Amino acid sequence: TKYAEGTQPFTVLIEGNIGSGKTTYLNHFEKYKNDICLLTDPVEKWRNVNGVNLLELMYKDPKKWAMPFQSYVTLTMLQSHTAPTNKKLKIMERSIFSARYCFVENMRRNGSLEQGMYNTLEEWYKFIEESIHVQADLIIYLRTSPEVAYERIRQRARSEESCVPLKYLQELHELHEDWLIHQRRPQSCKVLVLDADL
Amino acid sequence: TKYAEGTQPFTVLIEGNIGSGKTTYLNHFEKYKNDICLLTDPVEKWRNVNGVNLLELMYKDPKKWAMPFQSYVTLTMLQSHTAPTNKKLKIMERSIFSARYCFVENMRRNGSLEQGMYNTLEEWYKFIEESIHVQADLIIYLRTSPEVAYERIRQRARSEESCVPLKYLQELHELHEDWLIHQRRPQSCKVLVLDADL
Ligand SMILES: Cc1cn([C@H]2C[C@H](O)[C@@H](COP(=O)(O)OP(=O)(O)OP(=O)(O)O)O2)c(=O)[nH]c1=O
Ligand SMILES: Cc1cn([C@H]2C[C@H](O)[C@@H](COP(=O)(O)OP(=O)(O)OP(=O)(O)O)O2)c(=O)[nH]c1=O
Ligand SMILES: [Mg+2]
Ligand SMILES: [Mg+2]
Fold it and tell me: At what angle are helices B115-131 and A62-81 packed, to 10 degrees?
């Protein structure tokens, strides 16, 4: 009796650090557009919310903007998770799970999110889990070293990501490990590990 | 196919300004506890989120805390709107509609919520409308003058509300009028007006 329950096909989630090549990997499935539902680069939504760049505001002023930004990230993931499709396969760049277990968690650790903000978000995640169906059958984890991840972010040269230190990517990498390999976080899904260092 | 669709009885929403006597009115239905589902004073949740007083933080630092606070207000309203009950009647203090049309809107107007924060919240409200069933059959509008509303807030003497000016209550009153009498906002429901000046 959850929202979008029984309306979703086999769902594959593409995960990995910033600049791990999530979009590049999903760009290979481009020939089967009419066969597979492909939702790539949700970051473009976050860079342009009716003209407002939430990603830029988050990086410039985390103490003020990390909360509304993560809230919006959660929303867009949800809208993608529950989007209607007549296709037999759906591949998604990112998910609600990485937003929660990797990014929200690290922003709690580094002090970008105050306790009250972290708690508000966590209580939202718990309610979403009982109200909204999130289809997750397989997660492909594009495993990279923080050094290679940093290389790709530099080459793409998003103005918002120009101040991102290697320390930040090292933290996120370890959280990706905790969630997808070390199972320190609650998630019941099949994970395929890939060496994404080309 | 929305969450909690077809599981909700006749729902009455009690609305009105801060200190309009919403709880006092609902306290009269106290004898029929086993007959009517009574969810009063959701503000107590906001004053204590695992020990964090979000209401106090919002009033102390609106530019930083109005966003997470309204996000949590929305959540608690949703949890109350969709709460399971075997009773034939449900009466609710406040709703998701007043949080959106009165409080979020006024915080946008006074600059407590930046555009990006207002937009994030508004996009959440739009998605909630398609995903989650909100039962609303009758709204009882306890109509007060901002002066009488101010009187009651002072007598209750919530430490968080000690700095609330009459200007703020005048703004909220007019928004309550716009929504429930003047129909300035895209909404349609049964409204019973009451003179709550004792
Ligand atoms: C998912 C998510 C991303 N972000 C940020 C980190 C990044 O700067 C940006 C998008 O990163 P990613 O979500 O990793 O997407 P990407 O396109 O950068 O990945 P790839 O290069 O492998 O295709 O948004 C958050 O701040 N919080 C979140 O919850
Ligand atoms: C509903 C709501 C309340 N608030 C704040 C305003 C008040 O300080 C506090 C509770 O206000 P009310 O929701 O009006 O609850 P109340 O108990 O004060 O009402 P009454 O006296 O009529 O029983 O929470 C918001 O900031 N945003 C909201 O969306
Ligand atoms: Mg990408
Ligand atoms: Mg009350």
Answer: 30
Resolution in A: 2.5
Q: Residue B23, exposed/middle/buried by CB under 10 A (0-12, 13-18, 19+)?
A: middle
DSSP letter at A137 equals S
State the nearest Cα–Cα gap between A112 and chain B, in angstroms.
12
Measured CA to CA in angstroms, residue A134 lies from A58, A78, A97 at distances of 26, 8, 10
Q: Which residue has the tokens 């020990």?
A: B51
Residue A148: enclosing H or E segment and its boundaries? helix A146-156
- Which residues touch B47 (CB under 8 Å, ≥6 apart)? B53, B54, B55, B56, B160
Q: Is B124 touching A (CB cutoff 8 A)?
A: yes
| A138: three-class secondary structure by DSSP | strand
- Cα(B101)–Cα(B99) distance, rounded to whole angstroms? 6
Helices (H) and strands (E) in chain B, counts: 9, 5
B window 65-94, beta carbon within 8 A of A: 65, 67-69, 71-72, 75, 78-79, 82
Ligand lying closest to the C-alpha of residue A55: 1
Q: How was this structure determined?
A: X-ray
Computed from CA positions of residues B169, B175, B178, B180, in that sequence, does the dihedral angle turn out positive or negative?
Answer: negative
Q: Which domains does chain B have, with CATH numbers?
A: 1-198 (3.40.50.300)
Q: Which token pair is B50?
A: 């695992």
Three-state SS across B6-35?
Answer: CCCCEEEEEECCCCCCHHHHHHHHHHHCCC
Q: Is B52 helix (H, G, I), strand (E, B) or coil?
A: strand
**A118/B156 Cα distance (integer angstroms):** 30
Q: Of A95, A103, A93, A97, nearest to A66 (Cα)? A: A103
Task: Give, in degrees to the nearest 5, the angle at Cα B174 between B172 and B176.
Answer: 70
Question: SS3 string of B121-137?
Answer: HHHHHHHHHHHECCCCC
CA-wise closest residue to B136 among B176, B82, B178: B82
Enter the tokens of residue B43. 């503000």
